[PDB]
Amino acid sequence: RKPKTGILMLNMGGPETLGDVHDFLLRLFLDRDLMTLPIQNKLAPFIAKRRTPKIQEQYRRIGGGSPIKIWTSKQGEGMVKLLDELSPNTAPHKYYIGFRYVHPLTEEAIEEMERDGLERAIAFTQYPQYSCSTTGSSLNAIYRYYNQVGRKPTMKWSTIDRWPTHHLLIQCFADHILKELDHFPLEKRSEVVILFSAHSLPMSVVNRGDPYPQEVSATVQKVMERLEYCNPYRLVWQSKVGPMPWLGPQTDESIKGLCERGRKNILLVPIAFTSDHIETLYELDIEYSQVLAKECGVENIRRAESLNGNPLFSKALADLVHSHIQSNELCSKQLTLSCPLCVNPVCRETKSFFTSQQL
Amino acid sequence: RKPKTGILMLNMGGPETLGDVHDFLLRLFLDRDLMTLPIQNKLAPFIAKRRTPKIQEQYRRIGGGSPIKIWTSKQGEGMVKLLDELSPNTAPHKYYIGFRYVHPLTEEAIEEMERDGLERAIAFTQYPQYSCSTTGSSLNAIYRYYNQVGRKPTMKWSTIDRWPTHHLLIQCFADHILKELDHFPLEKRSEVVILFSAHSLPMSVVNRGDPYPQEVSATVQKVMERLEYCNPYRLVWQSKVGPMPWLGPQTDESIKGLCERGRKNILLVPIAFTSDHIETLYELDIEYSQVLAKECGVENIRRAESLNGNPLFSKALADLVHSHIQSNELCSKQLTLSCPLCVNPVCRETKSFFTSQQL
Numbered sequence A, B: 001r002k003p004k005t006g007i008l009m010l011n012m013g014g015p016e017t018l019g020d021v022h023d024f025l026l027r028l029f030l031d032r033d034l035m036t037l038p039i040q041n042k043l044a045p046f047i048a049k050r051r052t053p054k055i056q057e058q059y060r061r062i063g064g065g066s067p068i069k070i071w072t073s074k075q076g077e078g079m080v081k082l083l084d085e086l087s088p089n090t091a092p093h094k095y096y097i098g099f100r101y102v103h104p105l106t107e108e109a110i111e112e113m114e115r116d117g118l119e120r121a122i123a124f125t126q127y128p129q130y131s132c133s134t135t136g137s138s139l140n141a142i143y144r145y146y147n148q149v150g151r152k153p154t155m156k157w158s159t160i161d162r163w164p165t166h167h168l169l170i171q172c173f174a175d176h177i178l179k180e181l182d183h184f185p186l187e188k189r190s191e192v193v194i195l196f197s198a199h200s201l202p203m204s205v206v207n208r209g210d211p212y213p214q215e216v217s218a219t220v221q222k223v224m225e226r227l228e229y230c231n232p233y234r235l236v237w238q239s240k241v242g243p244m245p246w247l248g249p250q251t252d253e254s255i256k257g258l259c260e261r262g263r264k265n266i267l268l269v270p271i272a273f274t275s276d277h278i279e280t281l282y283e284l285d286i287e288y289s290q291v292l293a294k295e296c297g298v299e300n301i302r303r304a305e306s307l308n309g310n311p312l313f314s315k316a317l318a319d320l321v322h323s324h325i326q327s328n329e330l331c332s333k334q335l336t337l338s339c340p341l342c343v344n345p346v347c348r349e350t351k352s353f354f355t356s357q358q359l
């Protein structure tokens, strides 16, 4: 039967092949919800083209691109499967991929959700932890869309804007951590340092009140609680781009910092992005790792597998949608509140949109 | 009879009267574990005098001094009583007050714990969330004491170095929040914004890897989980002293930021310090509260009361010591791991000291 309940899966998406890099960077640096530059429509095209080469190299270092589109579909298909059996009253359920910087674009998925004549549309963020630069932008995209077309929705919108401590998300992290630990020498297992690595945020964003850091910290605690604190752990922030100040200990300097101090068995954990992505300096660059071993004696730096296609993740997705439908909520209580120092007119307009939806 | 189990309650302490302010700051600015200044033994004395007036004024604004000594005693007495019934095998128990910058000083309490011939001494930090500047300093003080007195322990030490998510602690917070919410007009209650306010940390401390922020974040999530996200919330960092950069949104700015954005009913929650301390700029200064009420229409700003003398707190303190003894652990797994960017050699010595304790 015709599709009743649509499920828009929001994520920034990623460049499918090295060829898509430029179009990805382009839309990203044009995102006024992610950032703001002086002349914007002019230097954005440049900045993209400019550093497009080094980003292409980075993606080449991990397989030649991002597998998010494939992975997201598998999970989407696995989620829909369970939704039909979980909540028949809202079936048939259909998932749509709403990527922010690559096809299928958010706006592209919305237009199809419309054309398909759905009764209930659910903006389901794929970032467990809320940041105004990730979920906020994907959510502002939906808003901006209708404000553009000029027209109003033809279906009821609602949203699952965050889920940093969902019990199944936590069980997945716990499972994957235990799996890697077993890849460490039997007698080293106990002294392995778990470094939860999440993407950093510029301090100016943190200081305006972004909820992201506190949420990621929450996810980390649930995980360790579940693992019964079997090992020591630390939450560090990876990558970080630019000369300006970014949050907490950088993942790079924390790894080096840890080896110069006796901890040689490190287990990195991607706690804030569910799909494979660009790794850290000590994982990609060899000379820097060569020095780290000749000067600190680093013996093991492992990475827990991304939630990728774990069957228990789909179950996590389906459960969230199900509770959502049950609860009748339009959005979390946290979305009804903008950053204490929020300076984006759009933000408040997006709040209204979801809290003002029919039913 | 003779006291079998001793319990050292660690905390920075506070000047009981305006007269004690000077020696308080003195010992504080002299704490190399808290901060490092050039020719510190010559600067601390100066900074103390140069700041004492400002602080006396602040303590006056809240009653004339700090009530931590009395409150810690009441909780101490109430902790002991519950321990003699809970742990008959380690009873009788005796609590000792080890304040870092005021009498009874940490060293004074240690020196008395031995004289009483204790079989087991427990360093129990009163800060639920671990920071190297609070719990770390209190713990490095115990180690520094034996490295000074030359001799070694006559009792078997162990420590409860953190407890950010202890269910009873979380329950006390959830109870005090519900109670303040009931002071707001029945119809504005759902609009109240919960501002969890914790003492900020210098960004240089956050970046070296202090666990404090992540743990404080955990406390916050457990509390809102318990209250079922009844209201929207934010974790902001208060006080913040100096010119350099300190962490996340500042309490003063967020309050103003929140009012400038239509949020008039705010509820402040002291999530990282269990006793009364210096309030924020908008709770003290009259002119600032005036400027705010005019340009924002701030209806009500309330502060949840400190855990202070809640009996459910003593039940919390007691439950922890009991579990600690039953678990037969010497310290948390987190203590065995230093900051990835740590540069205080004492840290490592304090670690060894506790993990190397007999039994």
Ligand SMILES: C=CC1=C(C)c2cc3[nH]c(cc4nc(cc5[nH]c(cc1n2)c(C)c5C=C)C(C)=C4CCC(=O)O)c(CCC(=O)O)c3C
Binding pocket: A025, A028, A034, A035, A051, A055, A127, A131, A133, A134, A199, A200, A201, A202, A205, A212, A239, A241, A272, A273, A277, A278
């Ligand atoms: C406002 C704050 C943020 C800014 C300005 C930001 C900027 C960027 N983020 C990028 C990529 C990326 N960022 C990413 C996840 C996040 N990024 C985040 C927050 C920000 N990310 C948060 C929060 C994330 C959550 C999970 C991912 C997954 C990529 C794609 C590349 C890679 O590093 O995996 C790129 C393009 C690649 C590069 O090396 O230039 C920029 C300019």
Ligand SMILES: C=CC1=C(C)c2cc3[nH]c(cc4nc(cc5[nH]c(cc1n2)c(C)c5C=C)C(C)=C4CCC(=O)O)c(CCC(=O)O)c3C
Binding pocket: B025, B028, B034, B035, B051, B055, B127, B131, B133, B134, B199, B200, B201, B202, B205, B212, B239, B241, B272, B273, B276, B277, B278, B279
């Ligand atoms: C390394 C990081 C830290 C520095 C440099 C720091 C510095 C200070 N902290 C003070 C007082 C204080 N700090 C306090 C809780 C904390 N302080 C903390 C971390 C730090 N605190 C953390 C973490 C806390 C919470 C658990 C309290 C309760 C006081 C006493 C007065 C007040 O703000 O109530 C004073 C004395 C008042 C003044 O302005 O001279 C200084 C200089």
Ligand SMILES: C[C@H](CCC(=O)O)[C@H]1CC[C@H]2[C@@H]3[C@H](O)C[C@@H]4C[C@H](O)CC[C@]4(C)[C@H]3C[C@H](O)[C@]12C
Binding pocket: A037, A038, A043, A047
């Ligand atoms: C002046 C402005 C800062 C605005 C702000 O934060 O308030 C900054 C932000 C982005 C910067 C630009 C980007 O870093 C891209 C270029 C980097 C080159 O090294 C200099 C020119 C370059 C084109 C920069 C010019 C200038 O420093 C910019 C435009």
Ligand SMILES: C[C@H](CCC(=O)O)[C@H]1CC[C@H]2[C@@H]3[C@H](O)C[C@@H]4C[C@H](O)CC[C@]4(C)[C@H]3C[C@H](O)[C@]12C
Binding pocket: A034, A035, A036, A037, A051, A202, A204, A205, A241, A242, A243, A244
């Ligand atoms: C990542 C990119 C290039 C730096 C690099 O070569 O790694 C830099 C250049 C322009 C930078 C942005 C501009 O300086 C404008 C903003 C300044 C704010 O303090 C942080 C976010 C902010 C939106 C910056 C994010 C990031 O640092 C940018 C986008």
Ligand SMILES: C[C@H](CCC(=O)O)[C@H]1CC[C@H]2[C@@H]3[C@H](O)C[C@@H]4C[C@H](O)CC[C@]4(C)[C@H]3C[C@H](O)[C@]12C
Binding pocket: B036, B037, B038, B043, B047
């Ligand atoms: C030079 C040194 C920085 C060393 C460091 O941490 O890297 C800084 C840190 C603390 C500073 C001092 C403190 O801020 C206290 C005083 C503040 C006064 O405004 C100037 C002198 C004053 C006595 C400062 C002198 C100098 O700027 C100090 C000593």
Ligand SMILES: C[C@H](CCC(=O)O)[C@H]1CC[C@H]2[C@@H]3[C@H](O)C[C@@H]4C[C@H](O)CC[C@]4(C)[C@H]3C[C@H](O)[C@]12C
Binding pocket: B034, B035, B036, B037, B047, B202, B204, B241, B242, B243, B244
């Ligand atoms: C705020 C206070 C007094 C300065 C003043 O007289 O106005 C100053 C004196 C000593 C300073 C501290 C010391 O310089 C040691 C640290 C130096 C780091 O770069 C920042 C945090 C750091 C922990 C400083 C925080 C703050 O600037 C202090 C605590």
Ligand code: FES
Binding pocket: A132, A136, A210, A337, A338, A339, A342, A343, A344, A347
């Ligand atoms: S930037 Fe966070 S609500 Fe607007």
Ligand code: FES
Binding pocket: B132, B136, B210, B337, B338, B339, B342, B343, B344, B347, B348
């Ligand atoms: S400063 Fe944190 S372990 Fe030394």
Ligand SMILES: [Pb+2]
Binding pocket: B199
């Ligand atoms: Pb302080």
